[PDB]
Design a protein around this ligand. Sequence first.
Ligand SMILES: Nc1ncnc2c1ncn2[C@@H]1O[C@H](CSCC[C@H](N)C(=O)O)[C@@H](O)[C@H]1O
Ligand SMILES: Nc1ncnc2c1ncn2[C@@H]1O[C@H](CSCC[C@H](N)C(=O)O)[C@@H](O)[C@H]1O
Lengths: 164, 169
Amino acid sequence: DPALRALQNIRIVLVETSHTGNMGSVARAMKTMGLTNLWLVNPLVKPDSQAIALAAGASDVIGNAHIVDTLDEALAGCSLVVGTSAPWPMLDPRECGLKSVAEAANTPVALVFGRERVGLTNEELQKCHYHVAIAANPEYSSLNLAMAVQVIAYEVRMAWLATQ
Amino acid sequence: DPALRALQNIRIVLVETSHTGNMGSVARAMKTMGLTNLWLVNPLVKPDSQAIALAAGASDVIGNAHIVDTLDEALAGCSLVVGTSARSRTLPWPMLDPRECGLKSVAEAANTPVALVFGRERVGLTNEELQKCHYHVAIAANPEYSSLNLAMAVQVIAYEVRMAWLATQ
Ligand SMILES: Nc1ncnc2c1ncn2[C@@H]1O[C@H](CSCC[C@H](N)C(=O)O)[C@@H](O)[C@H]1O
Ligand SMILES: Nc1ncnc2c1ncn2[C@@H]1O[C@H](CSCC[C@H](N)C(=O)O)[C@@H](O)[C@H]1O
């Protein structure tokens, strides 16, 4: 992937993921967009055969994932932290893509995703420079965790492609 | 949803979906973006408990899905048909990216039905199926690993549809 080096500094950080299936789906979503750098903060369960199954061809993303106890560990070294949630500085996914790719050229960037039902807590959201909301149906705005990663990752790759 | 009526004309058409879980996930992806009109063309098995479970709050999109025997049935009365496929040397076809597809889809759906056609897990659409489409849409991806899960591909396409709609506001 010609995009490999441009994107490798972008950390996808999953906070306290409940289901290993979603970790797998996340690794696939990432990998399709060229993202390789997965961080799991205190997952309920560590990745297992169901995560590997759903990762399929991207099981190497799982295999290389950093698993850490605390969010601060996953954010350590990042010049840009973006949290995703359905008063703070807001980006949309397209702007998040553009900003991430530009900052990732130089330094690590963290794109932080929350728990399947709860999302990110207030204390977690206050660690981010920006928040990203994916514009959605107000009747039903909650994407599946992996689907949300796919949207963000997709806009990251579009941003990279524009630099070409 | 303020988008409801502008997006109502857009049909998501899944061809021969194998796994009921994927029908549910697609229903969820669709609903979150304001799309509600799902067509299943010869599904291997009809939506069951697993579709309903993965649909979560979107089980009404499953509930209201049109199930038909032939792709032609799902395209009948559509002025624009877009199918998901990579660029092909074998069968060259005019290509959109998801962004252009959203823009074309929303412009067209303000007036007439539009069909966004997705293929089988793993293998996609046949050439005969692909020749019923005005355009093909290719999601640009990692050359080492360029196939999205069915429901993920729907999520991206639907996302670009809603972004196109949002542009109009
Ligand atoms: N509309 C949306 N915009 C941004 N992120 C979303 C989203 N829907 C889901 N997510 C991501 O998916 C995770 C699980 S959904 C958690 C509940 C709620 N939808 C929320 O966003 O807080 C979220 O923490 C977030 O990282
Ligand atoms: N990179 C991509 N671009 C467009 N659609 C894709 C895609 N990856 C997966 N899909 C969708 O998910 C379904 C199962 S995956 C099969 C991929 C298909 N053979 C192709 O070339 O596009 C496909 O039929 C398609 O609807």
